Amino acid sequence: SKFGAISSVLNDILSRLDPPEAEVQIDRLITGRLQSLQTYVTQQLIRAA
Amino acid sequence: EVFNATRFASVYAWNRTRISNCVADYSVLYNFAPFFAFKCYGVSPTKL
Amino acid sequence: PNCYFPLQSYGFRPTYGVGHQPYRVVVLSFELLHAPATVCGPKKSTNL
Amino acid sequence: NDLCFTNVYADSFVIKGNEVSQIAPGQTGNIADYNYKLPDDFTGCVIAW
Ligand SMILES: *[C@@H]1O[C@H](CO)[C@@H](O[C@@H]2O[C@H](CO)[C@@H](O)[C@H](O)[C@@H]2O)[C@H](O)[C@H]1NC(C)=O
Numbered sequence: 001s002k003f004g005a006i007s008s009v010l011n012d013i014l015s016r017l018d019p020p021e022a023e024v025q026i027d028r029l030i031t032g033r034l035q036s037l038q039t040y041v042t043q044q045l046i047r048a049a
Numbered sequence: 050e051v052f053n054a055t056r057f058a059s060v061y062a063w064n065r066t067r068i069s070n071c072v073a074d075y076s077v078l079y080n081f082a083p084f085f086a087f088k089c090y091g092v093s094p095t096k097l
Numbered sequence: 098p099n100c101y102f103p104l105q106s107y108g109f110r111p112t113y114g115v116g117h118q119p120y121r122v123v124v125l126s127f128e129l130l131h132a133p134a135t136v137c138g139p140k141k142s143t144n145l
Numbered sequence: 146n147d148l149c150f151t152n153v154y155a156d157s158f159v160i161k162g163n164e165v166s167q168i169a170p171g172q173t174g175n176i177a178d179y180n181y182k183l184p185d186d187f188t189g190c191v192i193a194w
């Protein structure tokens with residue numbers, strides 16, 4: 001999932017954008033994937049309970 | 050040849066050229082123009 | 098040929114466009130880290 | 146005027162008009178890659194006249 005960024009591939013976005021402009025899309029991917037992982041662990045906790 | 054032209058077409062009929070089957074080294078672009086706006090959107094000029 | 102000088106002359110003349118004008122640049126680098134500071138602005142020294 | 150800084154650094158040089166936009170953390174150009182480059186997490190001000 002692109003998560004509203006340039007692309008969903010970390011390596012491709014790093015190789016296509018410089019650090020001090022790409023870190024914004026990096027943070028976008030970070031927060032999207034991190035919210036996804038939080039949802040997954042919350043649902044897994046529900047299922048485990 | 051794109052930046053060496055003398056009769057750049059008007060914006061109403063903007064000339065459009067295709068660039069393929071070559072090696073793009075943007076040093077010639079950097080030294081071929083006194084840039085005023087180099088606003089890149091999809092790719093950073095640094096790693097171009 | 099194939100032995101180029103590392104640095105070339107940065108020549109100037111008063112007749113240059115804005116993209117070639119002699120711009121003077123000074124940068125001011127700070128360190129906003131936790132250490133005994135040395136510089137401030139306007140200050141007051143109210144008793145603790 | 147209301148902050149405190151450990152040590153202040155002032156680098157004075159002369160560059161071109163396009164180089165004014167060039168001089169920034171992690172940027173393009175022979176100048177920004179061989180002559181002088183700012184750190185990516187730069188915290189300061191740039192003055193050009
Ligand atoms: C857009 O500008 C190009 C500049 O290179 C033109 O290409 C050239 O066209 C001439 C003929 O006019 C060729 O002889 C030359 O080899 C080169 O291909 C291109 O034609 C132009 N396009 C339009 C629509 O004006």
Ligand SMILES: *[C@@H]1O[C@H](CO)[C@@H](O)[C@H](O)[C@H]1NC(C)=O
Nearest residue numbers: 052053054055056080081082
């Ligand atoms: C190409 O550019 C150079 C320098 O920018 C100039 O001297 C030359 O006249 C140009 N050629 C044409 C055909 O415009």
